[PDB]
């Protein structure tokens with residue numbers, strides 16, 4: 001039982017989603033830009049991911065620029081509420097499995113929380129080899 005907060009327009013997210021599938025599981029896909037987590041859910045995700053709230057913020061997007069978020073003048077709860085109101089600020093993808101939750105940047109971080117091994121070699125969209133046929137990480 002796996003959930004991915006996915007952005008089809010993200011190469012990292014597309015690579016992550018294909019690695020999930022290559023472990024033999026079809027995840028529940030949440031298109032977070034349109035169906036963001038609730039506050040409670042986002043707070044839990046952040047806790048489980050082991051990163052700071054700021055580390056989840058995606059840079060180079062309109063609200064990051066216009067709200068001035070690069071500046072260190074925001075508490076964690078201020079940043080969480082911005083993410084909820086502007087979901088493009090939530091970096092991607094976040095994956096939840098029975099083993100744990102991770103921000104899968106780079107995509108192969110997802111290998112930590114997938115329960116079943118990749119079923120064969122995996123190469124990212126751009127040609128970067130991730131696991132070989134034998135299952136060894138490169």
Ligand SMILES: [Cs+]
Pocket residue numbers: 035036037038
């Ligand atoms: Cs929701």
Ligand SMILES: [Cs+]
Pocket residue numbers: 062
């Ligand atoms: Cs806009």
Ligand SMILES: [Cs+]
Pocket residue numbers: 111112113114115
């Ligand atoms: Cs694992």
